[PDB]
Amino acid sequence: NPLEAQAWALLEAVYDPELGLDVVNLGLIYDLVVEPPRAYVRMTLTTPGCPLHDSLGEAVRQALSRLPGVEEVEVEVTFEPPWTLARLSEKARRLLGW
Amino acid sequence: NPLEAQAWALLEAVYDPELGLDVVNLGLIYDLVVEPPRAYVRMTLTTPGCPLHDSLGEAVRQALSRLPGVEEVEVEVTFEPPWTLARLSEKARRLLGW
Ligand SMILES: [Mg+2]
Ligand SMILES: [Mg+2]
């Protein structure tokens, strides 16, 4: 499903403002399912508590809505499990310096 | 602290759109501290997951910002503990019919 690869590439352009890294390499994407006309993503945030405006979740929704055949995007934001820097990818660790 | 009573009265005018009851009688307010120039409230939502726009949390922030002497309102939205109808007040149960 090349659509899935397309989805990841799109998400890799969405950045967390506090850490300056994309949501994929930060390890914020917990699940991703793309089955036209629907796209589903389960993700978390880098800090606890629901913000008044989930700008990151909105950016992810907008990114996935660009997928061909996708007319509805469900973005589920959860804290289960809770995120920590241990979820950073190998690439992210290179970009950081680690 | 009459300011505290003022705060509760203000919150009793903020309604959850899905249930048609105010946040206080629904049992959504977990903690409330009013110490000028700051107001703090910890609350939850009636359904899981962080919404893209936390309109309820915003309404609570706007309501408390009307308190005299209060210049900053911190609204913490959590799911710990998770909410259920068991947290409804006695009054809410009368209003419902129970
Ligand atoms: Mg972890
Ligand atoms: Mg309960």
- Output the six-digit token pair for A17: 């403002």
β-pair partners for B35 = B38
- Output the six-digit token pair for A31: 């699940």
In B51-81, which positions are buried (b, 16+ CB within 10 angstroms) versus exposed (e)? bbebebbebbbebbeebeebeebebebbbee
What region, left, alpha or beta, does residue A83 occupy, with left being phi > 0 and alpha being psi -120 to 50 degrees? beta
Which residues of A are less than 8 Å from B28 in CB distance? Answer: none
End-to-end CA distance of chain A: 33
Q: Say what the alpha-carbon torsion angle B49, B53, B55, B57 is, to the nearest 10 degrees.
A: 60
Q: Strand, helix or coil at B85?
A: helix
Domain boundaries along the sequence of chain B = 1-98
Q: Strand, helix or coil at B79?
A: coil
B52 in reach of chain A (CB within 8 A): yes
β-pair partners for A73 = A39
Q: Strand, helix or coil at B65?
A: coil
Q: Do B74 and B41 form a contact (C-beta atoms < 8 A)?
A: yes
Measured between alpha carbons, how far is residue A71 from residues A35, A40, A82, B79 in Å?
10, 11, 30, 30
Which residues of B are less than 8 Å from A81 in CB distance? Answer: none
Cα gap B67→B3, rounded to integer Å: 7
Give resolution in angstroms: 2.1
Q: Do B73 and B65 form a contact (C-beta atoms < 8 A)?
A: yes
- Output the six-digit token pair for B34: 């009013």
A45/B50 touch (CB, cutoff 8 Å), yes or no:
yes
User: A-B interface: how many C-beta pairs under 8 angstroms?
Assistant: 40
CATH superfamily for domain B1-98: Fe-S cluster assembly (FSCA) (3.30.300.130)
Cα gap B73→B41, rounded to integer Å: 8
Residue A5, class by beta-carbon neighbours within 10 Å (0-12 exposed, 13-18 middle, 19+ buried)?
exposed
Q: Which amino acid is at A84?
A: T
Written in H, E and C, the secondary structure of chain A is CHHHHHHHHHHCCCEECCCCEEHHHHCCEEEEEEECCEEEEEECCCCCCCCCECHHHHHHHHHHCCCCCCCEEEEEECCCCCCCHHHCCHHHHHHHCC
A74 in reach of chain B (CB within 8 A): no
Q: Do B11 and B64 form a contact (C-beta atoms < 8 A)?
A: yes
β-pair partners for B33 = B40
Cα gap B54→A74, rounded to integer Å: 16
Name residue, tokens 């994407």.
A29
Q: State how far residue A75 is from chain B, nearest Cα, in angstroms.
A: 9
H-helix or E-strand spanning residue B31: strand B29-35
The ligand with the least distance to the CA atom of A83 is: 1
